Write a protein that binds this ligand. Structure first.
Ligand code: NAD
Ligand code: NAD
Ligand code: NAD
Ligand code: NAD
Lengths: 300, 300, 296, 296
């Protein structure tokens, strides 16, 4: 039987994720939302594109969690002062997870809702799922923006640029230029220190840069691509090495917390958390980031 | 030098078309709109997804027609009572074409704006381009919905279903079940007459079906996929046989009019208009459709 | 756990089938052969291409059947006339089938129809899970000649046909279209007749050119597409060698017929409304196929 | 008008390169060879697979150089030691180059570096448009062994290396990473040393297995990726045999170095900060390459 992917929240990120996934013909897709008509319409529209692109994937829209039963992967993209933001997203996340988790006990849950690290922590607590199967998408998106800026500046193919980073988005991000390369060569060999610093800065503010341009909306093409790549990693058991929000039990000196770290991602979800040897400067950035993430967790 | 694709109108259809195209790595894409920030933001967002998907295509947003200079293909997706609709879209189309056409004299123009046939006619008149290089996208979308419904009903792969039709959307559509097959076998062998009639009806109202579900918006995934397939046909010179709005000079007894007909589409745009031998019933449908299209043209 | 595909026979068709399959990243591939070194070498070579093309699939070569255990699909391309191939086929299936009880077997060896029938008898598998590849290849050649003649995209040409290869083939120009439009609308009767004849002799044409070898690119592509249909349950409508129980008036025999191919193997055998002319061709073909069976 | 790719030499590497290229639908392909029938047969066979895979590219086989006219890229995979291949290379380039003055030539024949140098001399083409494929293949093997050992996706492993094949290869583990992370973090020193050695002997390993043949799947994939880099101006960063004018302290010679490959061919030669240990290896390798050149 085909793999089954359920996407909770048929907004810009959710429907765009469905688009990236359908074209890959990875499995059947279920788009769920609380708003009537929206998920059914977007699903049917995407589905009607199948004869043109040539993919045989069933794309259905629904308002009933019963249709997400026995999903292999669950993608949560239903999220919406700072304390109010947390409360609002916590209620939505709790509601989404408590109704979906029980119907797909063997599924891997991929959270996209912000505040990312906190919501992923909540999703694990509410689902009761083994920690390795509840992860958050954040690092892959930030790393993609970073890689795009590098390829653009260096004048090289985006396929030959790799990068690893940690933490969350914005101020919570932990950039690691030392761990970025172009075909195995340090990026510091292609880009001067000052320009590289500008690129790191642009990466931290990357999400806001899109917001300031759209005025009334946030990014969705890259966030969905990032989310889709993680879904593919699990379904095809590719063992991708990427930065994802995972539950830590001592790594980097952090415990009882979800934090963006390097992992091997496969069919079993987080199969391994890599512990990189960070220098003094890098640890300073990680500690500052960990602090902010911890604060958000405490508020939650 | 890479091929260059300019998309006029960075709304739902325009930006989604860019998405389908970027993933195919067909050429550099320019997204233009009159609204500041929107095209730049959507382009940058899509562009930042490139390292994840692995495509090396430059995706830029702009408000200046100067950036669409020397495009190989121009896609127009900037369109918005019935007489007022025509007037409104005619002004937009005229404005878009008069500013873009002169900067890309060798380009093929693919119109998507409604009323499709009329706007394509206007685009040809305003551009002064040879008629074979100014076509409209309509038939491929309707045929895709038709094919999707058949594959779904028959229980077969969407890759083995083919269909040809004529006319425009809705009431102007000319369904041709006789010219639809599953791996060379007439669909009438898989689906009873009554169910087939229902499918034809659903196809005629296919666009409205999405509208009634979204409430505040029309379809874009399939329309963009249909538009992208036509762009690919031209750039790769694939000689696709598909229904597109083309300028007729006697075919089917029609003259001085853009109408949805079967054509061979390649690098030179419309390389041949096929003349199918229609039976009495089919001709009745074509004449009724031609009449409505002519009326719209007269109003214009 | 990824899907598992075992290919018995690491020659031209088998290794090329591994190539088409690997690029699609459909599952892990096992290449088996009786010649030592050959499968290990070809598998490793294809495996080393993975970082360049970006596919994550294990390609392993072996001489041990134990490695093909729990395969989802078994492709047999090890044939070398009816005696030689029958012994080879019986040897391959008897050792493989027991280790993968839930697999779908796709036969490619010639004589195709008879060997598929044999594989079904030897494996004890339900008839719907033992099929042969033949029609997809012939149709592919036919579609190529049509596209070339009409000057249209190969993606817009479809065709159905029945029977076996060459003289046993049952052409059906009537059941071939370009974007739903009859091919008769693009190509005149005499030219169409020459294309059908070239289709009948398609295999021989390649042999006459290569001299020492037989075709493998198209045959392998045809086989891979069938494998994909099964693994993704795409329900492709294609001509394949299937076990008939009355369809077309034929019983107890494997014959090339149109089917809906999915995860359950042959999920449905289509019954085309053949006219008298087309029915005569089928009867003659069926007779030749039955002869091979009786000899078997 | 689609791009045009001509492949001189329709053997294992050449025909397989046509396969990888066709599936990508990058342009029309011409397969040329001196043996009659062989290229025509392989081209037709691959062409007949087009309706199945859905690619619209003409694949034509020929024995006439006139058919390779106006190619955007010319791939040379016709080599058969320095005398034999030199005569073959001179024969192929002298007839092809004049008919496609704007083409980028990609050499695959061995000895790679010397033959690329010869092709440059014979064609009169700017040095940036005459390159050889060698490093992409070795790096591919290295990346495969790393992925396999670390147990990670082959898409997340990158590596740079220089020089030629086997003993002339210049490994640079220091310049290899997994998602930007040094491979040294995943694989210990002794195990890494064994992987480098297996990389040096990679070609020979396939030959010892196949017995009568040499590798072709990976070599062809490596060649196709370079062809793609040029046709789409992707600006890939890869090791290729390029003409040096002082870089690394080397002059008047073709040597495997890291370059940015695009439509203009070698658009830039990268100068890596090699330590003393790595510099010694390069000097030794350069010496062996120069020897081949002097003999040439
Ligand atoms: N940096 C990133 O990776 C990134 C980028 C953009 C957005 N995001 C996050 O993704 C989430 C969605 O962003 P968006 O732009 O797609 O938003 P959106 O407003 O377009 O879509 C959210 C959808 O969730 C649905 N929804 C709300 N409550 C629900 C419930 N209880 N059950 C099911 N569906 C429910 C809504 O009706 C809506 O269709 C947000 O949490 C946002 O912060 C992350
Ligand atoms: N049946 C089909 O194939 C189909 C399906 C859907 C929509 N359409 C048609 O496609 C067009 C766009 O639909 P949409 O849903 O993407 O709409 P939309 O409102 O999302 O986007 C239209 C975009 O055009 C831009 N625009 C307006 N005037 C412009 C001008 N003079 N120059 C440049 N840009 C301008 C707007 O600012 C807007 O971003 C419409 O004409 C619509 O009727 C056809
Ligand atoms: N007309 C068509 O549709 C068509 C086209 C091509 C090939 N074929 C058929 O496909 C089969 C293979 O063709 P090929 O060109 O790849 O041949 P080939 O000779 O290159 O390869 C056959 C492989 O089978 C192996 N083999 C033999 N006995 C075996 C056994 N007992 N167990 C395991 N492996 C064994 C050989 O060692 C060899 O590597 C043949 O039966 C041939 O007739 C049909
Ligand atoms: N280590 C590597 O990176 C590597 C791997 C494989 C092959 N190679 C090299 O690639 C080349 C080809 O390898 P192969 O395995 O494909 O060999 P092959 O023997 O299968 O094919 C070579 C083809 O060249 C043709 N040929 C000979 N002289 C010709 C001429 N004057 N004009 C046109 N065609 C001519 C032959 O007829 C033959 O079809 C060799 O030089 C080999 O050393 C290098």
């Amino acid at each position: 039987m085909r793999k089954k992917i359920s996407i909770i929240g048929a907004g810009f990120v959710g429907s765009t994720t469905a688009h990236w996934l359908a074209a890959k013909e990875l499995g059947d897709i279920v788009l769920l939302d609380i708003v009537e008509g929206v998920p059914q319409g977007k699903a049917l529209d995407l589905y009607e594109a199948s004869p043109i692109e040539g993919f045989d994937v069933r794309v259905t829209g629904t308002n009933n969690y019963a249709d997400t039963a026995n999903s292999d992967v669950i993608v949560v993209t239903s999220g919406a002062s700072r304390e109010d933001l947390i409360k609002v997203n916590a209620d939505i996340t709790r509601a989404c997870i408590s109704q979906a988790a029980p119907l797909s006990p063997n599924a891997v849950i991929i959270m996209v809702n912000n505040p990312l690290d906190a919501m992923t922590y909540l999703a694990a607590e509410v689902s009761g799922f083994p920690k390795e199967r509840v992860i958050g998408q954040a690092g892959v998106l930030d790393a993609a923006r970073y890689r795009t800026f590098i390829a653009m500046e260096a004048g090289v193919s985006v396929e030959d640029v790799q990068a690893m980073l940690m933490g969350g988005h914005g101020d919570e991000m932990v950039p690691l230029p030392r761990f970025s390369t172009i075909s195995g060569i340090p990026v510091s060999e292609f880009i001067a220190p000052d320009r590289l610093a500008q690129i790191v800065e642009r990466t931290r503010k990357g999400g806001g840069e899109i917001v300031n341009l759209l005025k009334t909306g946030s990014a969705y093409y890259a966030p969905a691509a990032a989310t889709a790549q993680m879904v593919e990693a699990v379904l095809k058991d590719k063992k991708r090495v990427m930065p994802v929000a995972a539950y830590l039990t001592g790594q980097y000196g952090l415990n009882d917390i979800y934090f963006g770290v390097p992992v091997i991602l496969g069919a079993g979800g987080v199969e391994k958390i890599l512990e990189l040897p960070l220098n003094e400067e890098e640890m300073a950035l990680l500690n500052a980031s960990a602090k902010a993430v911890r604060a958000t967790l405490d508020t939650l």
